[PDB]
RNA sequence: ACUUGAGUGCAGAAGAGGAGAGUGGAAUUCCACGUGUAGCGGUGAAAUGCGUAGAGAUGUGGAGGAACACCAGUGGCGAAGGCGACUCUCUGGUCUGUAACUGACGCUGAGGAGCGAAAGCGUGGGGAGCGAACAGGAUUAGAUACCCUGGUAGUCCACGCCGUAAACGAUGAGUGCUAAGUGUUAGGGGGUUUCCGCCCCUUAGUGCUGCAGCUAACGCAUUAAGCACUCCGCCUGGGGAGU
């Protein structure tokens, strides 16, 4: 496959251990397609410029996933309608 | 003579970034009112202004740099 | 395409000389398989005229090389044609 | 798809039948056929209260969940079959229970797809779940009104809905033909627009296919005697004489609104009937 | 490309023939070779020294035209068109110029000159014509 | 037989080349409610129009369509028409560099095949802005126009037909050669240079300024309209008449 470095922020209204559940389950669904996601990150509660859905700032996030080719549209489209992930912009990774 | 002031602005210490994880050179690139910087007044190269413009957009898509500013 | 397993795999499965990367039977093999996969990949969304013009130019080049190999060696050209499958 | 017929005779010169590619098997489930009697526009008295029905072919009803009360257990589409009782087709589903149920068929499905129906279920086309869990903006059909009643709402072939944005109670829905009704939130609904999208472009062509369905022909306004219909009269092909076109009862049928004014739907509309 | 070699050499000696260049290149072939010995022996250019090597080529002649503008290469014309070929019998071998120039008809015993080919009295393909 | 032609390989580079899906804002319209009053609007000057049924403006929120400002430039890519927010899948092509292989496998190409802006045409969707026909008011002797206020089709999408344009560089394609300078991207070799940066050599593409040469003059000029070769198409006074 190819590297997919897609990082989509978590919602600011989330709770703490529920946010850990969101990263846990969302990381599981991203990891179900054979992609050993060899990267991670947590940029912290960092304010954005304009609102995403309702915040004046959110809890930023990152990702580093190495897979196909099989689950980039899965982790983007299957997370497009969640309540936690505000707006996931899954950029390609060829730097 | 014989060069540009602010000589190439990225070719001296680049290259190939950023884009998402960078907010620093993105902080020094996207202009004061909110627009992207002019490529004559900033001073980037051809490929430098191309990469910093693409990463300026792709870093503006994930809400990193503001899609509009104040006056 | 083509994938590297079919570039090096196809050149490895159809190498005319021991170290001959070209050998126009090899060019008809790589161009032929890449024209087929470009044929299905053009057929998947039948509006893209750019990729279609690529399919016409590529298929025409593979035809011209097929006529070249047919003019270069008769029996070996028949064996390459009947082994490859296309040209019929 | 839609085939078109070559004009072998004059019955054929416009007519189209659909390709019948979506269907797989002919002979349906014997154990869910419910019998029917074409009623013919009649009443329980015996009078014919619906004009110009009757004449049809022998229909036979197949039992359909328009509810999907069962939940969580995934389906597995065996066959998609044809039903003369409506436009759209029906997909036969073998649940893991063995409860073989004819259930209405959204597009994009074939044999073999998993269809759950819990509130936990997916937004894969076919899965069904109440309107709270549906996110803002999905293609939804089979909407109900009261919780668990049955899918009265949208069902016919090639139709859909949205969800514009909701509260705890209710869930707003841009239905088909633009009516935005505050539909209740715990209402079970299912996901996808309804299969056999090309029902509209079916050119009927010859006369008796409307008799095959069937529909008795209609006799127009300035044709009947001035007794029987309040347009008829004149010395033949007289103009449509009286002001305010009028049904075969004394009510105008250009735009005269027929909803009850004092009615329950005064609250249940944000936006209605774009015309 | 490569429509005609002799027209490429003739265009070479022509374009360099007006450029005022000291030496001139060429594609080394049997027509550039035998035409180099004929057109060099008749006294137009200084010397052709066919500096050969791998893979093909490559002739190198010098323009033997002095101070006076337009020396012994004063104007050349494709008398034979590769594509619509000229022909000349024995009695019809035409001597180009009239008294100044000389034509080079590729005879059946070697690439002759005009007067020498008339000395053999046998014509062939009109190879080129140097007016 | 051989290798530069042409092709394959190997490694680089680049782009708004295409097709499909999804996402994002700025702005206009419309709607709901607050705030508020007597004007808003448009022009050459006005009027039609809107506004005390509360407009304009301003605050908040929602819906929907279309196009993506800044980067952006006689920049890039494409056979041409053309192509611009961002991301992904599938895909074509170009150039650079050594140089492993092949050994002329090439150039053009009437028919034939295919694509081709915008207007249109059929069906079904979509209709926020713009907007023929149309309505009103203005200017004029007249206004089937210019202007302004509105306004249908269309523009948008998918599926099919249309196959024309100043479809322009008014220059068919391929190849070889022939003064120079100055830009500008995409590369490469190098002179010292860890850097960086300057400079040369080199390609490929593209812009200006100009020698020879061409020409009726304007002008072209290594991207020729120069100098020669291959092949296709077109031209034989205007109107009549692309009838």
UniProtKB/Swiss-Prot annotation, chain A:
It comes from the Bacteria. GO terms for cellular component: cytoplasm; ribonucleoprotein complex; ribosome. Induction: Strongly expressed during exponential growth, decreases 2-4-fold in stationary phase, part of the rpsF-ssbA-rpsR operon. The operon is induced by DNA damage by mitomycin C. Signal peptide: none annotated. GO terms for biological process: translation. HAMAP family: Ribosomal_bS6 (MF_00360). Binds together with bS18 to 16S ribosomal RNA. This is Small ribosomal subunit protein bS6. It comes from Bacillus subtilis (strain 168). The gene is rpsF.
Curated annotation (Swiss-Prot), chain B:
The keyword Ribonucleoprotein applies. SUPFAM superfamilies: Ribosomal protein S18. InterPro entries: Ribosomal_bS18, Ribosomal_bS18_CS, Ribosomal_bS18_sf. Keywords: Ribonucleoprotein, Ribosomal protein, RNA-binding, rRNA-binding. Pfam families: Ribosomal_S18 (PF01084). One of its GO terms (cellular component) is cytosolic small ribosomal subunit. The keyword Ribosomal protein applies. One of its GO terms (biological process) is translation. It comes from the Bacteria. Induction: Strongly expressed during exponential growth, decreases 2-4-fold in stationary phase, part of the rpsF-ssbA-rpsR operon. The operon is induced by DNA damage by mitomycin C. Binds as a heterodimer with protein bS6 to the central domain of the 16S rRNA, where it helps stabilize the platform of the 30S subunit. Part of the 30S ribosomal subunit. Forms a tight heterodimer with protein bS6. This is Small ribosomal subunit protein bS18. The lineage of its organism: Bacteria, Bacillati, Bacillota, Bacilli, Bacillales.
From Swiss-Prot, chain C:
CDD domains: Ribosomal_S15p_S13e. It holds the Pfam family Ribosomal_S15. Keywords: Ribonucleoprotein, Ribosomal protein, RNA-binding, rRNA-binding. Residues 1-23 are annotated as: Disordered. One of its GO terms (cellular component) is cytosolic small ribosomal subunit. One of the primary rRNA binding proteins, it binds directly to 16S rRNA where it helps nucleate assembly of the platform of the 30S subunit by binding and bridging several RNA helices of the 16S rRNA. Forms an intersubunit bridge (bridge B4) with the 23S rRNA of the 50S subunit in the ribosome. This is Small ribosomal subunit protein uS15.
From Swiss-Prot, chain D:
Residues 257-275 have a biased composition (Basic residues). It comes from the Bacteria. Residues 218-275 are annotated as: Disordered. One of its GO terms (biological process) is cytoplasmic translation. GO terms for cellular component: large ribosomal subunit. InterPro entries: NA-bd_OB-fold (IPR012340), Rib_uL2_dom2 (IPR014722), Ribosomal_uL2 (IPR002171), Ribosomal_uL2_bac/org-type (IPR005880), Ribosomal_uL2_C (IPR022669), Ribosomal_uL2_CS (IPR022671), Ribosomal_uL2_dom3 (IPR014726), Ribosomal_uL2_RNA-bd_dom (IPR022666). Keywords: Ribonucleoprotein, Ribosomal protein, RNA-binding, rRNA-binding. GO terms for molecular function: RNA binding; rRNA binding; structural constituent of ribosome; transferase activity. NCBIfam families: rplB_bact (TIGR01171). Belongs to the universal ribosomal protein uL2 family. Part of the 50S ribosomal subunit. Forms a bridge to the 30S subunit in the 70S ribosome. One of the primary rRNA binding proteins. Required for association of the 30S and 50S subunits to form the 70S ribosome, for tRNA binding and peptide bond formation. It has been suggested to have peptidyltransferase activity; this is somewhat controversial. Makes several contacts with the 16S rRNA in the 70S ribosome. This is Large ribosomal subunit protein uL2. It comes from Bacillus subtilis (strain 168). The gene is rplB.
């Amino acid at each position: 496959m190819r590297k997919y470095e897609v990082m989509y922020i978590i919602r600011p209204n989330i709770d703490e251990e529920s946010k850990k559940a969101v990263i846990e389950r969302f990381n599981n669904v991203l990891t179900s397609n054979g992609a050993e996601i060899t990267g991670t990150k947590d940029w912290g509660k960092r304010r954005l410029a304009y609102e995403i859905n309702d915040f004046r700032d959110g809890f930023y996030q990152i990702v580093n996933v190495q897979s196909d080719a099989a689950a980039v549209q899965e982790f983007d489209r299957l997370a497009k309608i969640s309540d936690d992930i505000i707006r996931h912009i899954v950029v390609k990774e060829e730097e | 003579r014989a060069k540009r002031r602010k000589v190439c602005y990225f070719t001296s210490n680049g290259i190939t970034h950023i884009d998402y994880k960078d907010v620093d050179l993105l902080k020094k690139f996207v202009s004061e009112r909110g627009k992207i910087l002019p490529r004559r007044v900033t001073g980037t190269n051809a490929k430098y202004q191309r990469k910093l413009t693409a990463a300026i957009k792709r870093a503006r898509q994930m809400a990193l740099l503001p899609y509009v500013s104040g006056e | 395409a083509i994938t590297q397993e079919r570039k090096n795999q196809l050149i490895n499965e159809f190498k005319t000389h021991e170290s001959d990367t070209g050998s126009p039977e090899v060019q008809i093999a790589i161009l032929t398989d890449s024209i087929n996969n470009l044929n299905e990949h053009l057929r998947t969304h039948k509006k893209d005229h750019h990729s279609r013009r690529g399919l016409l130019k590529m298929v025409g080049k593979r035809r011209n090389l097929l006529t070249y190999l047919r003019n270069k060696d008769v029996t070996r050209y028949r064996e390459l044609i009947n082994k490859l499958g296309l040209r019929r | 798809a839609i085939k078109k017929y070559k004009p072998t005779s004059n019955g054929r010169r416009g007519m189209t039948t659909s390709d019948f590619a979506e269907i797989t098997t002919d002979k349906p489930e014997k154990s869910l056929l419910a019998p029917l009697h074409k009623k013919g526009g009649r009443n329980n008295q015996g009078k014919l209260t619906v004009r110009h029905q009757g004449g049809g072919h022998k229909r036979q009803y197949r039992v359909i969940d328009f509810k999907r009360d069962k939940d969580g257990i995934p389906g597995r589409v065996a066959t998609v079959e044809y039903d003369p009782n409506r436009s759209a087709n029906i997909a036969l589903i073998n649940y893991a229970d063995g409860e073989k149920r004819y259930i209405l068929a959204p597009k994009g499905i074939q044999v073999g797809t998993e269809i759950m129906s819990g509130p936990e279920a997916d937004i894969k086309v076919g899965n069904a779940l109440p309107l709270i869990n549906i996110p803002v903006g999905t293609v939804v059909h089979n909407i109900e009104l009261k919780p668990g009643k049955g899918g009265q709402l949208v069902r016919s072939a090639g139709t859909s809905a949205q969800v514009l944005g909701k509260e705890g109670k209710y869930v707003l829905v841009r239905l088909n033909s633009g009516e935005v009704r505050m539909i209740l939130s715990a209402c079970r609904a299912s996901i996808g627009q309804v299969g056999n999208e090309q029902h509209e472009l079916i050119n009927i062509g010859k006369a008796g296919r409307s008799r095959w369905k069937g529909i008795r022909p209609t006799v127009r306004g300035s044709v009947m005697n001035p007794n029987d219909h309040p347009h008829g009269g004149g010395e033949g092909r007289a103009p449509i004489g009286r002001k305010s076109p009028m049904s075969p009862w004394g009510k105008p049928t250009l735009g005269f609104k027929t909803r009850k004014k004092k009615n329950k739907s005064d609250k249940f509309i944000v936006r209605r009937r774009k015309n | 490309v490569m429509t005609d070699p002799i027209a490429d050499m003739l265009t070479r000696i022509r374009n360099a023939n007006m450029v005022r260049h000291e030496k001139l290149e060429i594609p080394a072939s049997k027509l550039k070779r035998e035409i180099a010995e004929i057109l060099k022996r008749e006294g137009f250019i200084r010397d052709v020294e066919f500096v050969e090597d791998s893979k093909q080529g490559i002739i190198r002649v010098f323009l033997k035209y002095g101070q006076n503008n337009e020396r012994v290469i004063t104007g050349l014309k494709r008398i034979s068109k590769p594509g619509l070929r000229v022909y000349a019998k024995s009695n019809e071998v035409p001597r180009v110029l009239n008294g100044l120039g000389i034509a080079i008809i590729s005879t059946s015993q070697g690439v002759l000159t005009d007067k020498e080919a008339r000395a053999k009295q046998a014509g062939g393909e009109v190879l080129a014509y140097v007016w």
